[PDB]
A paper describes a structure:
The final step in the pathway is catalyzed by a 2-epimerase, which utilizes [name],[name],3-dideoxy-d-glucuronic acid as its substrate. The focus of this investigation is on the ORF WP_011172736, which we demonstrate encodes for a 2-epimerase. We have also demonstrated that the T. thermophilus enzyme is allosterically regulated by [name]-GlcNAc.
Given the unexpected presence of [name]-GlcNAc in structure 4, we next conducted crystallization trials that included both [name]-GlcNAc3NAcA and [name]-GlcNAc. Crystals were obtained at pH 9.0 (structure 6) and pH 6.0 (structure 7). Both models at pH 9.0 and 6.0 were determined to 2.2 Å resolution and refined to overall R-factors of 19.4% and 17.5%, respectively. Regardless of pH, each subunit of the dimer contained both [name]-GlcNAc3NAcA in the active site and [name]-GlcNAc in the auxiliary binding pocket.
Author numbering:
A (entry chain B): -6 to 364
B (entry chain A): 1 to 360
The structure:
Amino acid sequence: NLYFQGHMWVKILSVVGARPQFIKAAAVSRVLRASPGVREVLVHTGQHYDDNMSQVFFEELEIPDPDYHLGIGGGTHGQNTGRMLEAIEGVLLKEKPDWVLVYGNTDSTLAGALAAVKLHIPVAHVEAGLRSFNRRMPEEINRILTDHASDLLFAPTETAVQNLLREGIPENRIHLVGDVMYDAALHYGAKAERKSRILERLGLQAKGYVLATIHRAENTDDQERLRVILEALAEVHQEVPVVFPVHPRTRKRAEAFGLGSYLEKVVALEPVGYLDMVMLEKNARLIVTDSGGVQKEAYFYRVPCVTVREETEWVELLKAEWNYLAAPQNAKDLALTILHRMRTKGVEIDLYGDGRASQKISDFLRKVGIR
Amino acid sequence: MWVKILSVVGARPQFIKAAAVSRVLRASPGVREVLVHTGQHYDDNMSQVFFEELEIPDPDYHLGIGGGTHGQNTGRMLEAIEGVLLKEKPDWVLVYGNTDSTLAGALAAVKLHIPVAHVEAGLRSFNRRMPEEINRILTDHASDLLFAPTETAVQNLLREGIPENRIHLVGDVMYDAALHYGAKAERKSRILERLGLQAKGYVLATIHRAENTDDQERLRVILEALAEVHQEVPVVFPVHPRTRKRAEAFGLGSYLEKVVALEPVGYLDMVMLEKNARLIVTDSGGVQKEAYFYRVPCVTVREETEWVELLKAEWNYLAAPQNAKDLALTILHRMRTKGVEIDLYGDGRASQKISDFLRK
Ligand SMILES: CC(=O)N[C@H]1[C@@H](OP(=O)(O)OP(=O)(O)OC[C@H]2O[C@@H](n3ccc(=O)[nH]c3=O)[C@H](O)[C@@H]2O)O[C@H](C(=O)O)[C@@H](O)[C@@H]1NC(C)=O
Ligand SMILES: CC(=O)N[C@H]1[C@@H](OP(=O)(O)OP(=O)(O)OC[C@H]2O[C@@H](n3ccc(=O)[nH]c3=O)[C@H](O)[C@@H]2O)O[C@H](C(=O)O)[C@@H](O)[C@@H]1NC(C)=O
Ligand SMILES: CC(=O)N[C@H]1[C@@H](OP(=O)(O)OP(=O)(O)OC[C@H]2O[C@@H](n3ccc(=O)[nH]c3=O)[C@H](O)[C@@H]2O)O[C@H](CO)[C@@H](O)[C@@H]1O
Ligand SMILES: CC(=O)N[C@H]1[C@@H](OP(=O)(O)OP(=O)(O)OC[C@H]2O[C@@H](n3ccc(=O)[nH]c3=O)[C@H](O)[C@@H]2O)O[C@H](CO)[C@@H](O)[C@@H]1O
Ligand SMILES: [Cl-]
Ligand SMILES: [Cl-]
């Protein structure tokens, strides 16, 4: 035996529930699965369950079948989170992992953190420390409580680091690693370029359209806010075609509120896969969204962005002038704002790291040691 | 115009706090209170006895959730509490202390955008293994109003970036309760008579922290320490059912027969035992304050406490359970001590301060 023979396994269990969590997990899981002395276990809470919200990401992003599908979703915050909490705990007692990874800030994120910390299993938070400072948002609650329940905090931004320090989280548990969604954009771009012909199937050409997505509860749960958004987009479409993959939350609200006819006024799609989405974003003249990740991706592709919200967690994008908030207060103004910004670019700047946040995270999990 | 306050209570120390605050809210103009009992504590001697002897109004809801894991108790409470909130739509949800019930109620509420107010906010053990440290950090960070009992708790909240306009130093509602119920206790408690004890003729012990009961070696040290003490001065020991169950589980039941072990007692009986003890040994949060209220020296069987002013003032002493004999001696040696004269925890109107803030 010449070389040193290591005898130590760590079991890392990831908890995912929703579309953006599968994307982040695809970047991180792949590095962990390739890491010596790492056994990864993946739990799918069931929060997102339609194939174009879940299965399609497992296919295109090459994620192994979850070890557990919990089958929980569609309910209230109370039912989803409550049921996930108890179910995730069951798994934890079975699998007895050394670390629990949770991602972003869905109800699934919070359920996993809570299930784990009370069993004294160390929680690590991928995308830690983002603040909208708007507690009406369920996502803000989620990230605050998850962060304060975590033993490791993988911040993507300096602002995120500052947020955590300001809430008394000790500096030694915080690591600025950048953003794994940039890793993912880099890792899957060639496959998107190879495999999507969404542009060919919509008869669209590069820079000849605007891409839009809207699903924030505060935008969809209010009939008249939603109307401002659908009406604005419809106005924009007369000037530049608007492509709009429509989230199931958004469709369900549009329907119940009777606003369905507005979707005839733009190029509305079922929700798309990541590969088609990359191609759509890459080639847009402008992106209008209330998504977190999409704001970032627009910048990756150096496409201008409008965020239809009263705030963003991703403030560096505003400072760099790649992003611009426009709250949905009236349709005329929203539309005018969109058309004006279609002519803009931000400044050249390198945000979100080197595309290897996944490797940093894996390295930090493996070397923390038994406290 | 009128204001609706829904209160969530699960366990014994929450009933006691609720009693103080309830009496004042109910009596207050422009206020309905709805009371939700999660079911976390359910034995008659941990729950009904408090409603009855403290004349707490019947809970509008009894969820009947208890006896399971953290994840079962909390996740079920979360769903069940939310259901009631959807029905009642209060202006404020009120939580107390730091049980699994506390967290479920806060979390149920904040996702419905109902303002949450934390009664007894900002206490910190800095021991993140305690399920109660997590409960309070998360509850505090989910709350809109923070009723701190001490300057330390104010400081703890500011250091975690919680804004000062949300923090009110109101003292301790458990002081209110002690003052209000003191006379009834005097009139109605016959527990000294029943147990054959004389005033200042025994030590009072309670023990129930998870780190003391789930850990066999810690639990053994404690029970062994108390049995040694009892040889010198009788030890009176109302045993938390968790503690009873863990002691039976680890085969330490016999130590309970070597002191004056009791089932858990009512508040009135407890006040009488506390008042008349030579010294109190506990790992309870509330009992360490109460010993101070009755100028009875306290020994706290833990590595830390949230109530650090009780150490500062020499009314309370830490004794971690490392060694049965070291613990027995520390207990016996603290018996004839006393702390300095100082007023902690306010004027006994913490509840009315609380009530005023809510109405305004
Ligand atoms: C506002 C907010 O809190 N957001 C949180 C939220 O994410 P988010 O708002 O980005 O959700 P979302 O837009 O559904 O997904 C985008 C992805 O879908 C792809 N995407 C989008 C549409 C589509 O049809 N196809 C497709 O592939 C896009 O290419 C893109 O890769 O949940 C996340 C999570 O917990 O992990 C948190 O990290 C977020 N926190 C932050 C701060 O961004
Ligand atoms: C350490 C810890 O986290 N503790 C938290 C915990 O309380 P605690 O540890 O005091 O539990 P506990 O000792 O059963 O009750 C004592 C009462 O029972 C009475 N008591 C006691 C024994 C008895 O037989 N009869 C009786 O009437 C006594 O007279 C006394 O009035 O739950 C509380 C809650 O969530 O509201 C938190 O505020 C506490 N946080 C703090 C910081 O003290
Ligand atoms: C509270 C929470 O965790 N919110 C997140 C959730 O929003 P999202 O709106 O998806 O939140 P939910 O998981 O509660 O789903 C809401 C509703 O969408 C419908 N539905 C959802 C999924 C599905 O596959 N099919 C379906 O029809 C159901 O009616 C369901 O009740 O995921 C988004 C990513 O896309 C995130 O940006 C949001 O932060
Ligand atoms: C996690 C949590 O919230 N812990 C609190 C809980 O501890 P406590 O130890 O009561 O915590 P639980 O509510 O989880 O109860 C633990 C176990 O005690 C037994 N049991 C409980 C209640 C009852 O009426 N009968 C019975 O037998 C059950 O086996 C139960 O499973 O209440 C204490 C008040 O006394 C508080 O100091 C603790 O902070
Ligand atoms: Cl979307
Ligand atoms: Cl007890």
